[PDB]
Design a protein around this ligand. Sequence first.
Ligand SMILES: OC[C@H]1O[C@@H](O[C@H]2[C@H](O)[C@H](O)[C@H](O[C@H]3[C@H](O)[C@H](O)[C@H](O)O[C@@H]3CO)O[C@@H]2CO)[C@@H](O)[C@@H](O)[C@@H]1O
Ligand SMILES: C[As](C)(=O)[O-]
Length: 451
Amino acid sequence: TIAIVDADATAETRSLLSYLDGVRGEGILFGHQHTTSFGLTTGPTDGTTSDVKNVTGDFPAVFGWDTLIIEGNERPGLAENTRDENIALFADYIRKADAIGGVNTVSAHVENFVTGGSFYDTSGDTLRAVLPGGSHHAELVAYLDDIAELADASRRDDGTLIPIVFRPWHENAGSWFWWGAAYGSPGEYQELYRFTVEYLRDVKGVSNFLYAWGPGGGFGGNRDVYLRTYPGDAFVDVLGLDTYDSTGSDAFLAGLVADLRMIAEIADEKGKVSAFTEFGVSGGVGTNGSSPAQWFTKVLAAIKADPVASRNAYMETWANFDAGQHFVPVPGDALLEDFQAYAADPFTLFASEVTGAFDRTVAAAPAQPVVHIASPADGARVASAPTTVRVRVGGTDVQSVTVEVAQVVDTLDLAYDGALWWTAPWSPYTVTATATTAAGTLDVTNEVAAA
Ligand SMILES: OC[C@H]1O[C@@H](O[C@H]2[C@H](O)[C@H](O)[C@H](O[C@H]3[C@H](O)[C@H](O)[C@H](O)O[C@@H]3CO)O[C@@H]2CO)[C@@H](O)[C@@H](O)[C@@H]1O
Ligand SMILES: C[As](C)(=O)[O-]
């Protein structure tokens, strides 16, 4: 019995969460983004060749992907293709990866619905326009639906659902993405993540997803800051950390070891998994990147040297798009030899070293009851116009749900919308939801503001 966000996950899925946690401290799986769809020594990709495979002799233990594929921006996705065809290619690649014997992970550099721009376009107030009751909520819904398609298409020839570690809205601590810190409060972010998990799990029925959350990096091991964004235990399976450096300095390494041992502790206390979700030399290790001396081994040495910092399930460096930008060395790059040294290290696990990750027999503890106010989210500013207060109570049968706007200015009696939320009209500081549930009385409080 293990704690998994989706209490109804498939056998293999639960098996993976079980594997990923047991592996911590024993060996770290090396992952590579677009490892068989983007290469420099492979030639035209097709989902079977990989630069890692060509320089190290084995595929990474983890294959990384991104929703950009569906968008048609990252192969095998193609601009021409309809999203429905790209989804088919993505699933095919996910199949070949699993066939190779690897573990699949997926990130989402979601397009800026509001402006038509990319994830790097941080204008349009897209974060808030996408949240429950948002002016572009439907767009996000539509996007998540395509993600549900992908979840379902990811099956073995026997029809068995391939487990996928979903890592949505990453690095929100920074502001280089429209869903970052400068565009929403910790609370607004949380509702964004939570609605994501609930829509896919509860509304779409996905059952082969382990949800991952990684705010960023460079926390100096500060639990407080790190967690400020945490969606909460009933929404996260994997606690991540994203950190790139290009100095190999001891200072860098010290900080990295601090963040790694932190997430590891939080993970242990919470009975969840922790991993180095993203890592690598800044700007890559190619033409436009940098070749810090023995960077790869210096980092491994740093990770192993610490008993706690090493209790992280995997570490994935980024894509090998081209010469200027690629994170895994190829003939000609200075770090090529060091990266091989790192691969040959007994502590780094690769595809062929992965065994007993899906055939395990584990039970998912019962989903824990939870209740949050989807709107208005915590730390959000409320408009004078009438708005709908929506509460979500999960993991138990709800008899009733009440809300109290204090400052007590109002008292609302909510009603289930038959699909996800308990709602009610509110024509405007403290919104407190109380739900009389089968698991007892659950209450929650969001704090907002008028204009
Ligand atoms: O423009 C045509 C060119 O597009 C390439 O694919 C792009 C992606 O569409 C996307 O822009 C991606 O963004 C990267 C970003 O550059 C950086 O690496 C960041 O760390 O991660 C994001 C996404 O993971 O960059 C790639 C390539 O740079 C590809 O389809 C080319 O074949 C095509 O000609
Ligand atoms: C490589 As990135 C933009 O996901 O940190």
